Design a protein around this ligand. Sequence first.
Ligand SMILES: Nc1ncnc2c1ncn2[C@@H]1O[C@H](COP(=O)(O)OP(=O)(O)OP(=O)(O)O)[C@@H](O)[C@H]1O
Ligand SMILES: Nc1ncnc2c1ncn2[C@@H]1O[C@H](COP(=O)(O)OP(=O)(O)O)[C@@H](O)[C@H]1O
Ligand SMILES: Nc1ncnc2c1ncn2[C@@H]1O[C@H](COP(=O)(O)OP(=O)(O)O)[C@@H](O)[C@H]1O
Ligand SMILES: [Mg+2]
Ligand SMILES: [Mg+2]
Ligand SMILES: [Mg+2]
Lengths: 52, 52, 460, 458, 513, 85, 86, 173
Amino acid sequence: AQAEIEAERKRAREELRKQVAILAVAGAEKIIERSVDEAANSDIVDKLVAEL
Amino acid sequence: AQAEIEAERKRAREELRKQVAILAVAGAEKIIERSVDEAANSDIVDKLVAEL
Amino acid sequence: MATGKIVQVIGAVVDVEFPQDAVPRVYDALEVQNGNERLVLEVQQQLGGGIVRTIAMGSSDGLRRGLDVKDLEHPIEVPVGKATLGRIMNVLGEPVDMKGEIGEEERWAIHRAAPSYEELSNSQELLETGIKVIDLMAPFAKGGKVGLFGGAGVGKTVNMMELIRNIAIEHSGYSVFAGVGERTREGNDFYHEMTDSNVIDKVSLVYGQMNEPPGNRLRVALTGLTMAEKFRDEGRDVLLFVDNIYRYTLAGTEVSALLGRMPSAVGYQPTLAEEMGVLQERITSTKTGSITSVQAVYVPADDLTDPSPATTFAHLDATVVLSRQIASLGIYPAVDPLDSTSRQLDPLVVGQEHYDTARGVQSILQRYQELKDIIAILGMDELSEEDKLVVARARKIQRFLSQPFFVAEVFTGSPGKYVSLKDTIRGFKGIMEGEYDHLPEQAFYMVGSIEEAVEKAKKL
Amino acid sequence: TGKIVQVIGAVVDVEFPQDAVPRVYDALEVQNGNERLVLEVQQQLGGGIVRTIAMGSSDGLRRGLDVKDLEHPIEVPVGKATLGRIMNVLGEPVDMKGEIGEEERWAIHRAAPSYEELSNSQELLETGIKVIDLMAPFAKGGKVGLFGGAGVGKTVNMMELIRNIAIEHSGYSVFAGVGERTREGNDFYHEMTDSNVIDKVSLVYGQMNEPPGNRLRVALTGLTMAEKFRDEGRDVLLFVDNIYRYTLAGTEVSALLGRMPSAVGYQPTLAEEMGVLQERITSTKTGSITSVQAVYVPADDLTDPSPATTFAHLDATVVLSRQIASLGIYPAVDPLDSTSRQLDPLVVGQEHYDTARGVQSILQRYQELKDIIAILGMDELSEEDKLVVARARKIQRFLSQPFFVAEVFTGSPGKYVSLKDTIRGFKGIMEGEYDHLPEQAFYMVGSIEEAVEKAKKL
Amino acid sequence: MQLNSTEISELIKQRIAQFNVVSEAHNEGTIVSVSDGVIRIHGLADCMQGEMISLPGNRYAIALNLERDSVGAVVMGPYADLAEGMKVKCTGRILEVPVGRGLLGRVVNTLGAPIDGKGPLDHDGFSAVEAIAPGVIERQSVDQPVQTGYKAVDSMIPIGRGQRELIIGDRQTGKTALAIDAIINQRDSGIKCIYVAIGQKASTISNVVRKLEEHGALANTIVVVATASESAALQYLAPYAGCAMGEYFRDRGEDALIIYDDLSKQAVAYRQISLLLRRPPGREAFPGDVFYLHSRLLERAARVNAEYVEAFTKGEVKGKTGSLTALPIIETQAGDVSAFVPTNVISITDGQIFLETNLFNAGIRPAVNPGISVSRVGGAAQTKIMKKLSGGIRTALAQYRELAAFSQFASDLDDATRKQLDHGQKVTELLKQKQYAPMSVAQQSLVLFAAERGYLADVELSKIGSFEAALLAYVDRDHAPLMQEINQTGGYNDEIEGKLKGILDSFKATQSW
Amino acid sequence: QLNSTEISELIKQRIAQFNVVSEAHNEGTIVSVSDGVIRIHGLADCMQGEMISLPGNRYAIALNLERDSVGAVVMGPYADLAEGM
Amino acid sequence: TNVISITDGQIFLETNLFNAGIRPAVNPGISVSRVGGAAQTKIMKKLSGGIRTALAQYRELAAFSQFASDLDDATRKQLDHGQKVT
Amino acid sequence: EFITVARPYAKAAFDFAVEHQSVERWQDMLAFAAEVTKNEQMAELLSGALAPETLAESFIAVAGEQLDENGQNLIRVMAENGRLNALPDVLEQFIHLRAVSEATAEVDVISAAALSEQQLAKISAAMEKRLSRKVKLNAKIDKSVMAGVIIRAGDMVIDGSVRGRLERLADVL
Ligand SMILES: Nc1ncnc2c1ncn2[C@@H]1O[C@H](COP(=O)(O)OP(=O)(O)OP(=O)(O)O)[C@@H](O)[C@H]1O
Ligand SMILES: Nc1ncnc2c1ncn2[C@@H]1O[C@H](COP(=O)(O)OP(=O)(O)O)[C@@H](O)[C@H]1O
Ligand SMILES: Nc1ncnc2c1ncn2[C@@H]1O[C@H](COP(=O)(O)OP(=O)(O)O)[C@@H](O)[C@H]1O
Ligand SMILES: [Mg+2]
Ligand SMILES: [Mg+2]
Ligand SMILES: [Mg+2]
């Protein structure tokens, strides 16, 4: 089971790369009480994949 | 042994959500970093003083 | 209006700064609002320029600096008189039994001067307790003080419960019970015992429980004492039970250390023998009335010499020492007949009949101690006729000093007995003369009065 | 960029600009003339001051010198490079050989391994010492401690444990000398180097001569080296020369740091100072440390605060005593105070446990008679008590043994006794089947068969 | 399962959503000192005593000195990272700890953080660490047994639900073993157990937890850990964190048992904290209020009558009395009980179990010294079968202790006393017991009846233990219904006495040991 | 750091005019009361072992003559003395 | 004890022996030399052997062998030599 | 440190300066008396164990800007108590007491940027409703507080910064 959950874990690491950006934008918006359809997505993805 | 397996699953879910939280708030900061704006910023000031 | 402000809070010690026209006097009581709860502080020292150092009569947590302190201009003062009988109160004279307002007519400050040497009156009226060994071997008079000495588990507390029951049921005397540093478990046991025995309506209870700051455990003895003084000034004869002098002195040590005084003999405060005297000098039989007292005094590690029990002996008139060894053989009240003593035990006051019966019991037992260690090595049969007879009478006396209590009725189920002094003397003298030599020993165990021995001997 | 402003004994106060003040346990530096001196900061007082301990001779420091703020704690070489070499408390090489070629340096202040990571093992360790593994067996990965006054045998015993377990163990080994003789450290280094095992052992030495800062922080350097080896996945032997000197060096400095004294003069932080060290010397799921610690007890008082707080940190405690050594019975282990966590039927098996408890029962019954024997003489005993005494006085001798490292003192060649071979001997003596042999037949022998032989020759 | 990363991400979204971004005014101060775990904060005009001050990083300090121009606060965690000039906030909060039913079977440090690595807790909310015990009028007299499973204790030194019994003795005499057998024996009794360890080394906590796991007990108990490496504030506050977790049960009509291991190390941690705050020291350098430190901890062990429960649970639980039982442990140097902390806690508690190192060496295990051990609750807490039978053991041992002096001249004695002097030794050899082997009340009652009624008068001393084992085995198969009855009710009757006499008669003849 | 019984308004008086010996030095004022001992400020010409006469017709014995104040013990009930007398 | 812990041995001079005219009153059994024989000339090392344990044994043997004695010829020669030595 | 020993002298000096309506003169008298304490040499002489009044005289000699009775007397008392090094803090406590008595306070505005001067108006006005005093702003700028504003008054702060929102959120997660 312990070497199986290790497969589950890296599948989840693959998946979460997509949710994290949505989380970042939602947090930023609730913090600043405003919507921002940010332009320079470059910075978003540069973090979206580097440390993940 | 089954209890131990379930405990490892809980532990891994938690240590995963920690990573995503870290990257999430760092990204929200990088988002504010370029959505920040003299007009919206002055609006923050206005709202906090009005609430003061 | 409130005219002072807190400036330090270190544990249970609080400092308050007043304008120099309004400094509280020593022992004055202050009040502060600990949020949604009222708290009173007792001034211990005036130091510096309007600053005052105080002990909190309550939990210290939650105090900010700068809170407004309003000073009462009178010491802690408590309700007194009949209104308090049957109630339970804390050091501040507030009810802790949920039955509501005390209905006091009058309030007295707990700090007052002891009677003058002029006001006392020496009267030798013996108390009658209903407990064979104490009435026989350690008599004590009105106005006197009795110290129950012993280690842990020997029966100080149940002996005091039985004394309360006897005095209140047979002689109708008001009693004040002051629990200095009281185990809340034993305090609830006491409350339910006295309410079951139906004596409660002739006792007033004061509890300073162990979980309370030192300032509470220290002053409680004075609250009980003040209630007793009110009853004396009504011309009654009251009786004051203090549940431990040892914990009174420990509270004194704590308060001393907290105030930062330089310690003394074995750690105790410097003022130990003054605190003890300030207390034990208010308990006296002024001409108007009387206060008698019996006081439990734990002896730590069986030394009888550390300053706390060593300093109290100077104030006691009779001392009853309880031993765990005797208790372990099952003969309660577990009093040691040889070690207990009294100043009132001399012919002039107790009468020759009593004095001689007491000294006879002592002689018999003191010889039986010699003989135990012959019987061990040689066996019984090598003794003389009178030696075997001294042994039989010694064992019968040693049995007959046990008694069943109305308050121990809950541990053993057997109903209690009250034995008048006439009957105690008559019984022991009858045993020593050899009138009852024809009964077996067990006829005397837990028997109560002497007639009950001749009755119990039938059924055995 | 900071100035000295006081010098009290070993502790030095340094003043920095308000914004630059160093953190706790950072290491500063001073040029003590034609020299270099390292200070370890211990406290931050207010106002940009900081109060430190000098890792060197404090003499020669003026007020107003200039100190440099290294921005990191003390760090020592670590790994295979450290191996077979002698090192200072600062991790400098102290033999005459070259630089330590280490790849990596670790700070000597670290946290203990999480409770989540500990490991627990019952695997017994055999030692060739009758008394130690009869009464106080200990396990691979555990802690052992030798308690005793001055001059009773807690160093010779540690050298025998080294000889017995450390040569017959493959992995690396670390020896920390804390505040004990330099002569003994030199003898040890040369014995190693002349038996070619030096290249498995690492040495660290802050011996009696050094100032209090060295004797204070050297044990942590030793621990850091052992902790590296542990975390590589190896298993390690860690011997500490005298751990009492660490708390003593703490006491020497305590007052100068401005701390109110405590029970018998000791520092207030005694138990924390000792826990924070004793708690990182442990085994773990990734590796394991077996450690033997000598613990001096001052004035032979086993209730002094320092031994009394150490008893709680050890698995197997061996307690030496002067009243046994004065009878010539080495090793002077007292069997009525030695003890082990491992002495359970479920671990050592019924027979060994039962033999150990029988020996203890006899020796205690013998203690209970010594007052009547002292007063009235041996003739007033019951006829069965004379037998208890006659067997205890044999058990005491048979607990004696000659050591390979004690040939220097007594000529007699050392012996190695296997456990199987000693529980049999004690079961024999207790059961009274060697009950026809003189006392001196048992003194300083190996197995029970060397005793039955020694009896023939007187 | 975990592949449902939707759970993870949506849950993060829930934490985001409920973040109310409004601002709150707070009071502030600055660190001006750092040393040995104490910090001095200049500012915080509105700090309260006992308040939790909040440092940088998720760290806190307990403000203990409100001096005129400073606040002395003790850091609850590794302090070496703090620095002069850091900024600090005064929350309004007091220290609160997780509590509830889910903690059973978990290991937690003194802040209720899980330390065993089995993932987050499932608590039932939070509770204040520092509280005040139930008053005089809310107690109920203790009259129920809590069984230890030791012949030596449950007969001569009963412990009742709601009592506070001190285990005291020198190092390495079984103080921990006795308490942990007391905990194991509750594996099926309805009593929840809490074992709080002060200042022990972690690889020992792990060992006793591994033993509670061997036997069934771990699933029933909470472990609170403050290892020897943790700062003094945590070691000192751990017992309150444990009591607050036992009171969750007491205040809801259930029974609990709490075991403070080494109050003699809480006292040491508190001494360190006091001396670093420069408070005036007392005897042995202990601060003044070290009585009031333990007093208000132990007086939380209580039995509360059903009306206080109904008032607290707002009518949800009726007619049940809650109870919290405490067994603090103390360590005495060289058997000396006249030191400061022993002499306080001996005064606070309801009884004492004195463990002697001589008895422990001589073979007597557990080493309880019957002649100076006491229990003020006494027989009121026993099952009435035990209450009946143990009275005679008290006297047998008391006569043995009075005669024992002659044992060293015994051959000279007279048989009329030799009978007693041998019955004492046989009953003493009877109270020896092996570790991790608890006895049900039926077995202790049977084995004491055997010795009280003279059956052992002829068995030889060295065999008493095999006699006992054989008897306990026999009865378990050939008379099981009687054991079931006794264990289930504890009653006593001439009928039961006849059945026991029959069992002993049949055993002593028809079998062997 | 300890203050030595120099306090707000005494310092104000000294602000008024430094040498205050214009006041007759036969007399003083209490500045502290505790445990039966009092600190008296003033009393320049107190002599060690002297009798100091308190209000209410009581006496104190001057035992400590210090650089700024006289420490004395009270010969009777002290609880009702107050700073300023 | 502090100093017994720093040195390489001790010569313990006992006052009981010294009053009995045994001078120097070297008490064997407590006194030891932690460097041992490594320091001695070869002749001295050969001759001395473990002599000091011989006198330690003789001196404790005299502890029981005053009011009574057993094995009373071999203990007798042990005592004789120990006495002529001292 | 000298905060706790400056308090009595500060309070006494202020009481006197109120009774003589000369607060404003005392304040600068004390500032000068403080700066004399900071001189390289005087600070040496202040540590040397001179007898009190000789030290007092050597100190007065250096001051002609002290009003010849009351300032001298303060200095002389402080010399009697060896507390001359406390002047730097007697000054601060005098200033604070003046503030408290005149019911005038000072509050700090720390911001990502300078404000639009009606923001400052609203701020100060509402502060005089948090606090009763006449409030004197002194805004400052920083960018660690990338957005929002911080209002720090005495030791009570209201955290409106966005940084204090980010980190305050992160610790929830
Ligand atoms: N009933 C018993 N029978 C036999 N051995 C026992 C018994 N109880 C305890 N022991 C043994 O005594 C040893 C010490 O036990 P334990 O650690 O519980 O004592 P302790 O007082 O906790 O010591 P410490 O104070 O160091 O924790 C243990 O190894 C245990 O095996
Ligand atoms: N006369 C008696 N009859 C029965 N039990 C008694 C008697 N006296 C004392 N005890 C027992 O002694 C125990 C403690 O008694 P207590 O008076 O509290 O002792 P202490 O004097 O130490 O307080 C109680 O459990 C009680 O059962
Ligand atoms: N097995 C042994 N045989 C003989 N002598 C021994 C033995 N063990 C220790 N000793 C003696 O113990 C004495 C004390 O030495 P040491 O162990 O260094 O004490 P310490 O522990 O203080 O260092 C030594 O001089 C040595 O002769
Ligand atoms: Mg009692
Ligand atoms: Mg040594
Ligand atoms: Mg333990």
